[PDB]
Amino acid sequence: PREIITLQLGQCGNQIGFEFWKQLCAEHGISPEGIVEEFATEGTDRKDVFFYQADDEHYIPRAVLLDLEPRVIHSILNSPYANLYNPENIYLSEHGGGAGNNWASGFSQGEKIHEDIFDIIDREADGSDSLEGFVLCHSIAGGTGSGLGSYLLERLNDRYPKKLVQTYSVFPNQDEMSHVVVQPYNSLLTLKRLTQNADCVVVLDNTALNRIATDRLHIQNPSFSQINQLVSTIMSASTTTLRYPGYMNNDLIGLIASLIPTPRLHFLMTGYTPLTTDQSVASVRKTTVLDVMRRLLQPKNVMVSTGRDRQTNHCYIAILNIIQGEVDPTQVHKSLQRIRERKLANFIPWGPASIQVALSRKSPYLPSAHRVSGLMMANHTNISSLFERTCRQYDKLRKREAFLEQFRKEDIFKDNFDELDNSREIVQQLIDEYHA
Amino acid sequence: PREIITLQLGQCGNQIGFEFWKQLCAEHGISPEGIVEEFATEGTDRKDVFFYQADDEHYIPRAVLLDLEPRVIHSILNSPYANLYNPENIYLSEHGGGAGNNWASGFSQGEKIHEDIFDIIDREADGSDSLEGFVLCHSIAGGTGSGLGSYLLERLNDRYPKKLVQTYSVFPNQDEMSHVVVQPYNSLLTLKRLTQNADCVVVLDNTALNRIATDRLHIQNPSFSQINQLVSTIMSASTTTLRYPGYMNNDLIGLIASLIPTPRLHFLMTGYTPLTTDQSVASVRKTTVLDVMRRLLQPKNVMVSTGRDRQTNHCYIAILNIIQGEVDPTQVHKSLQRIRERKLANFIPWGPASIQVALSRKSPYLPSAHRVSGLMMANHTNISSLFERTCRQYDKLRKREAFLEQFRKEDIFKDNFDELDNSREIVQQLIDEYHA
Amino acid sequence: MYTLKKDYRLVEYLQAMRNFFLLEAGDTMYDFYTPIFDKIREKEPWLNLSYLNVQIQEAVGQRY
């Protein structure tokens, strides 16, 4: 089994992982307490490589939902999904915590529910006989999800360090600063852990998110409850090599390893094209495969903020372009030929880059049976642009004298302020030294 | 016509056989009067095998209960099955007792109640067609089972040499020293008769009993009432090749002949999978029969405390895995294909070992015809740890100067203490020599 | 072609040997491979025929 145990943590990290499971139930066509169709084995050929294997003809996800506020998990028992999950082997109903908005609460709460936090992942791993890893779906948004998630990057990198560590971080909207004020602190605190307590991550941003939500989803005002729709689908899109047949890189640690050349450059930008429902009327005339990877190499679907004058002094190094559903697997070699003549992907000025192309067959569902799907998993060397945005609001904040002694009460009593600042400066420099 | 007389002796020896007779009436479907279930003859093809041979459709336990403690036996005659019991060939109704709680109390009371203790097994062997043997359901806890139990370990070795000897040696929690402290003295006098005047023992430790009582029946604070279900089940469990026909090693001296390499090594560890209520959910469609002995390939349910790291400095020699009821047996030859490949049970290197597989029919009673069962009767040479553990509790007791003249006011007036030490080290060398 | 499609299931047999040794299959031949390949990585005898005959037994039971 290539069972990955998801570590959903956080007020926002729970919800984006919640519709990740409901999506899998909508396309496998299942009841959340019974397997009522033959689409479970005809549609999908593995259904328990991320789920606990059938012993009642039913599938139980390999997810744990622990959080300081029991209120996000109490909203799972008002939906028919609290018998898809179980009452202690997924989540403990009424597991309290802090206030919680402090990072230093959640960091100390992993150090005293320390016994139970590594029994819940191993209660829910009694059929993993060869573990993939642990993916921490933990949000930076809120002090709840960033505090307890930063603890678990450390204890799972000292017992399972060669196994996958990979987080879906979402840095809260950096154009508010009177909604969240602890925002440069909780970001730089997890960012220290991504580079020496972790292998690879897949970063995201909220302020580059909502750009797309009004351009391809076309909502009237960004609010978190549509943001979770767009995230929950790219999480089921990235595992379509491991839940359906394949061979070359048919593991989730097969895809992600080949997007790393050097530590401190492994931050993957995510892009996903079929969010528009006006491409299902342009498939009666055929949407082609030639141009569906000419909008993946275009920067339009970018969920990580960055300049359009920082891609002329930087080039992409590794870019993976995943088609699902229709593809036509004889003209996919016709699709890559025209890439080099336009040059929509930049190539590193010290050797050839890499365009890895993949295809995968899927279960019947609407962007994998009527219309083309493109997942991008980019690797660009302009990723220091978020780190400069968070580090210039962190030292500015220290110039307003905020959280230098209103943060030293609970388990910070040394100078660790310059520890986040400098380790961020090693990252901002080492990327530029290895990129001309 | 293979009638066994259980000999309950001691304080703990009376509580464990109480629910043993209570398991038999509930699975044979019978009333304490007559027949109310025709599964009584169709399911059990040998109803009489621990019971009186009926001649008016009555069944009588072949039980004898002698003990110097009237508190434990007064809870046996105030039972609904106190009419299954008759105080006229078993015991008195309101029976008496010795001091007791001393090994010299019950050893001397053994020989002035010598007429009735060998005229109460021959008042339960008068319809007998040949006696199988005697099972000494005696305690290692206190001086009561151990005083009176050391006597019958001797006389059944020479008034009854042909007949089978086999004991349920149950330890108390050995870390008591204020309700019992004479436990390493009374233990070793009985442990010496058990290896030279007895052929087989069935060892049971208590620290691995409470190991199950908190993770398979789940109490927050221990009780000794979740300890008597665990023994009473494994008692009826060993006799599924004998209460219901076998074919080969259909005798109980057949199982034991292939489980004993030679006396000097005969201490069988016992293991039992269906003690938990989460094994009735693995028989609603039948879970596969490949995995029910690859959980006994390295135990995790043993009623004998031992390390899991003392399985690589020791080598199993004989291991029996008796499967019971409906298991859909046709992929059971597939299960022995996969045993050699893992090797979690090391086999002896001076010569071949034995992987014994059995199946047995049982009545259509729900926990004997639905749940997947693995009953282990192991014989592993890592048992030398228990003998080193009682001997470390003796030698510490003699330097506090306790029982150097306090135990030799009664029926000890000669040296025999280093005889108990030496006889333990010959037994300990000869267990380890059989894997050398 | 009526008895060679229903009586004997010919074309299902064709994709079946292709799943074996053309590598057209899923994580069937993948999970056969990585136990053997972890023994190669430390240069310890992986042949050892016997366990390999149980590794393809385990292969064909993956994906179901």
UniProtKB/Swiss-Prot annotation, chains A, B:
Gene Ontology MF terms in the entry: GTP binding; microtubule nucleator activity; tubulin binding
TM region(s), chain numbering: none
Full protein name: Tubulin gamma-1 chain
Family classification: Belongs to the tubulin family.
Gene Ontology CC: centrosome; cytoplasm; gamma-tubulin complex; gamma-tubulin ring complex; mitotic spindle microtubule; nucleus; polar microtubule; spindle
GO biological process: one example: microtubule nucleation
Keywords: Cytoplasm, Cytoskeleton, GTP-binding, Microtubule, Nucleotide-binding
Function in brief: Tubulin is the major constituent of microtubules. The gamma chain is found at microtubule organizing centers (MTOC) such as the spindle poles or the centrosome, suggesting that it is involved in the minus-end nucleation of microtubule assembly.
InterPro entries: Gamma_tubulin, Tub_FtsZ_C, Tubulin, Tubulin/FtsZ-like_C, Tubulin/FtsZ_2-layer-sand-dom, Tubulin/FtsZ_GTPase_sf, Tubulin_C, Tubulin_CS
Compartments where located: Cytoplasm, Cytoskeleton, Microtubule organizing center, Centrosome; Cytoplasm, Cytoskeleton, Spindle
Binding site for GTP: A141, G142, G143, T144, G145, S146, G147
Organism of derivation: Xenopus laevis
